[PDB]
Paper text:
The O-linked β-N-acetyl-d-glucosamine (O-[name]) transferase ([name]) and the hydrolase O-GlcNAcase (OGA) together orchestrate protein O-GlcNAcylation, a dynamic co/posttranslational modification cycling on thousands of nucleocytoplasmic proteins.
OGTN567K was then cocrystallized with a donor analog, UDP-5S-[name], and 2 [name] acceptor peptide substrates, P1 (KKVPVSRA) and P2 (KKVAVSRA), previously used for activity measurements. The OGTN567K structure superposed onto that of OGTWT with an rmsd of 0.4 Å across 675 Cα atoms, suggesting the mutation does not induce large conformational changes in the catalytic domain. Surprisingly, this only covered the P2 backbone in the +2 through to −2 subsites, suggesting that the N567K mutation may induce increased flexibility at the N-terminal tail of the acceptor peptide. Close inspection of the OGTN567K acceptor substrate binding cleft revealed that the protrusion caused by the N567K mutation partially occupies the position of the −2 proline frequently observed in [name] acceptor peptides. Our structural analysis has uncovered that the N567K mutation changes the surface of the substrate binding pocket, thereby altering substrate binding ability of the N567K [name].
Numbering used by the authors:
A (entry chain A): 325 to 725, 729 to 756, 772 to 1037
B (entry chain C): 3 to 7
């Protein structure tokens, strides 16, 4: 009981976030009673939380050695192995825990989680059900299951699930315990802005607790530019400098920064994945530092202090790979959220969120913990101009007698191929070449229908858009610009040559009952037309098909394609007429993708940052007519775009031109505007004020 | 290759 009292205290000191004192106490417990299984296992869990994973494992095994049937040690060891990427060891432990005790609900939930992460959603669902059946009051398992069901669009008892998620969160915040809804997901559920902000705040608070063991004073922050030769030192922190959407958005930014006034440091939180994305940020940033090499957060945060960073930019928020502990230690006087996280951090350690007036209006500043810092057009950016310049221009083949989106050719050398052809008609819009149905035209369409990889016409290489990974796998990922002429057609994706194609290329989780109802309403109003979605994942397809049958729609109306390599995804958006944006959470990166194809996107901005991004893109692009203030307006815009064929031609033309004329895809301009705002943020601080809203 | 919690 001397030992027990130390252990029980340590357990409470841990629930409190007092991690150092918990450790001392478990050690003191083991000093007093060495053969104490539960204190080994508890010490192991807190060593795991601190990142000391080998030490943790050692205590888990001691605990198991003392009590061979201690299922909870196996279950928590499982988690430690999973955090070390030893998926096999994790599974060997979880399953051993469930063999020892099949009624052990925590083990079931942990197994479910590793099922979900591995891509086995039906098994994750089954195992969370088992957990909830063994322990019906189990917030983590319930909310994590609610996410799996979201992912595959299972909306069985949707309305009660939703209010159940809200009361769990209310109840968790009452008791100031960590909410089981993850902050990144909180935009999907009908919670108050207060709750979303508090969810975030509580997750930021974990980071504050992990760093207190280090006992670091506040750092001393440079108050003028004088020892950095008059340059604002800016530090971009990301797990995503590699093959990740973040790099697909901002890889050109670092190297566009003005080196007379700015000095750029990229802090990678991930190791080098071998991709051009990584190579480019490493080459073009003034300094590149691999923090994944320096796991200790105090030592890593030191580097950032000694580099001299003025502004430290958090590109992760609450996403995978985050090390927000870095920002909790405040190695810099200005710390801003940018681009990668579509929400508020909720934490005191972040000063601004870089956003914009259309995304985060003045009125809803209470949504965020941070002060608003406006970019002048949209905060969103895309590297599409650099990545996919072969999509700047297109040509078509005229199959009968003229469509912009049926049979499409793109290529760096397309002009020259065209000029090699006997008859080619130009159609004003600036212009779209049309290849009439010659022998040449027929050879192409045959390669497609035959599933052939490529053919040669007049010395030019003509590639099947379905086969890019076989021709050049770096061009499929967007790492290289394709060096051939590529053909893309509705035929390849089983789309009708003779009807309207509405699209949405997002992960299926962004869809909800209301949203699919609106889509159904639109398709019923526009006979012939189809809705073009992705298998993202594939096991969500029958749920979507069934809920749409129930709403009115015959089956043939919704066509699913596989997820494609990056360049094919962006290229194929050309085959659509219109994109219907998800209002619950908009296409963000996916919105830029569709617009770069020239495809107009209809959207209904909501309240959340996540539900207003597409509206900011369209504003910047200058297509206010595509933004709806309610559901009836969205369906009328979309039905109008599928029936008024001349207005469709006009709207398309505007998107097609304005993707070049507008600022949307103008990385140099974006960068220069980002620079102004960074300097605004710096002035307002050197004149010793503290963060305030910038507009 | 996606943004994830
Ligand atoms: C809700 C949310 O998390 N929002 C985030 C933003 O707020 C952050 O700023 C972004 C972080 O940099 S990512 C994110 O933007 P999202 O629109 O959600 O895209 P998501 O994260 O699902 O990935 C789909 C990817 O698959 C690619 N993609 C898609 C289909 C396909 O067939 N092939 C393909 O390569 C697409 O080109 C994409 O690259």
């Amino acid at each position: 009981t001397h030992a027990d009292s130390l252990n029980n205290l340590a357990n409470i000191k841990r629930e409190q976030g007092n991690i150092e004192e918990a450790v001392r106490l478990y050690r003191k417990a083991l000093e007093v009673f060495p053969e104490f299984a539960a204190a080994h296992s508890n010490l192991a869990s807190v060593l795991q939380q601190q990142g000391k994973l080998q030490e943790a494992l050692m205590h888990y095994k001691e605990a198991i050695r003392i009590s061979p049937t201690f299922a909870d040690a196996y279950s928590n060891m499982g988690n430690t192995l999973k955090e070390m990427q030893d998926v096999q060891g994790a599974l060997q432990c979880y399953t051993r825990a469930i063999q020892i005790n099949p009624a052990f609900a925590d083990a079931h939930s942990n197994l479910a989680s590793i099922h979900k992460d591995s891509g086995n959603i039906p098994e994750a669902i089954a195992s969370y059900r088992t957990a909830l059946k063994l322990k019906p009051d189990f917030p983590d398992a319930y909310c994590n299951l609610a996410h799996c069901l979201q992912i595959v669009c299972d909306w069985t008892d949707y309305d009660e699930r939703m209010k159940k998620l809200v009361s769990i969160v209310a109840d968790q915040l009452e008791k100031n315990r960590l909410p089981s809804v993850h902050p990144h997901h909180s935009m999907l559920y009908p919670l108050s802005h207060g709750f979303r902000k508090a969810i975030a705040e509580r997750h930021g608070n974990l980071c504050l607790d992990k760093i207190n063991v280090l006992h670091k004073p506040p750092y001393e922050h440079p108050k003028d530019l004088k020892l950095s030769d008059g340059r604002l030192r800016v530090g971009y922190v990301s797990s995503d400098f590699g093959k990740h959407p973040t790099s697909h958005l901002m890889q050109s930014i670092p190297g566009m920064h003005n080196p007379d006034k700015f000095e750029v440091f990229c802090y990678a939180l991930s190791p080098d994945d071998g991709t051009n994305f990584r190579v480019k940020v490493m080459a073009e940033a003034n300094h590149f530092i691999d923090l994944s090499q320096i796991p200790c957060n105090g030592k890593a945060a030191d580097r950032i202090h000694q580099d001299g960073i003025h502004i430290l930019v958090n590109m992760n928020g609450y996403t995978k790979g985050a090390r927000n502990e870095l920002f909790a230690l405040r190695p810099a006087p200005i710390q801003a959220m940018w681009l990668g996280y579509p929400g508020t951090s909720g934490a005191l350690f972040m000063d601004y969120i870089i956003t914009d007036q259309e995304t985060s209006p003045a009125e809803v500043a209470e949504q965020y913990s941070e002060k608003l810092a406006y970019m002048p057009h949209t905060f969103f950016i895309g590297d599409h101009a650099n990545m996919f310049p072969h999509l700047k221009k297109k040509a078509v083949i005229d199959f009968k007698s003229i469509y912009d989106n049926r049979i499409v050719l793109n290529g760096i050398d397309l002009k020259a191929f065209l000029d090699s052809l006997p008859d080619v008609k130009i159609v004003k819009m600036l212009n779209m070449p049309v290849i009439p149905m010659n022998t040449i035209a027929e050879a192409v369409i045959e390669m497609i229908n035959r599933g052939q990889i490529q053919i040669t016409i007049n010395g030019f290489s003509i590639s099947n858009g379905l086969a890019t990974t076989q021709i050049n796998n770096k061009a499929a990922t967007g790492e290289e610009v394709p060096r051939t002429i590529i053909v893309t057609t509705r035929s390849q994706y089983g789309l009708p040559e003779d009807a309207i194609v509405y699209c949405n290329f997002n992960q299926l989780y962004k869809i909800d009952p209301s949203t699919l109802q609106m889509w159904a309403n639109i398709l019923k109003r526009v006979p012939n037309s189809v809705l073009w979605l992705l298998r993202f994942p594939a096991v969500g397809e029958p749920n979507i098909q069934q809920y749409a049958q129930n709403m009115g729609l015959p089956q043939n109306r919704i066509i699913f394609s596989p997820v494609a390599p990056k360049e094919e995804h962006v290229r194929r958006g050309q085959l659509a007429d219109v994109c219907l944006d998800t209002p619950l959470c908009n296409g963000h990166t996916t919105g830029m993708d569709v617009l770069w194809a020239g495809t107009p996107m209809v959207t209904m901005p909501g309240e959340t940052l996540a539900s207003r991004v597409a509206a900011s893109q369209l504003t910047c692009l200058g297509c206010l007519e595509l933004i709806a203030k309610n559901r009836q307006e969205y369906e009328d815009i979309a039905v109008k775009l599928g029936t008024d064929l001349e207005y469709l031609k006009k709207v398309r033309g505007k998107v097609w031109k304005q993707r070049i004329s507008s600022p949307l895809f103008n990385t140099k301009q974006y960068t220069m505007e980002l620079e102004r705002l960074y300097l605004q943020m710096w002035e307002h601080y050197a004149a010793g004020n503290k963060p305030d809203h910038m507009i | 290759a996606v943004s994830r919690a």
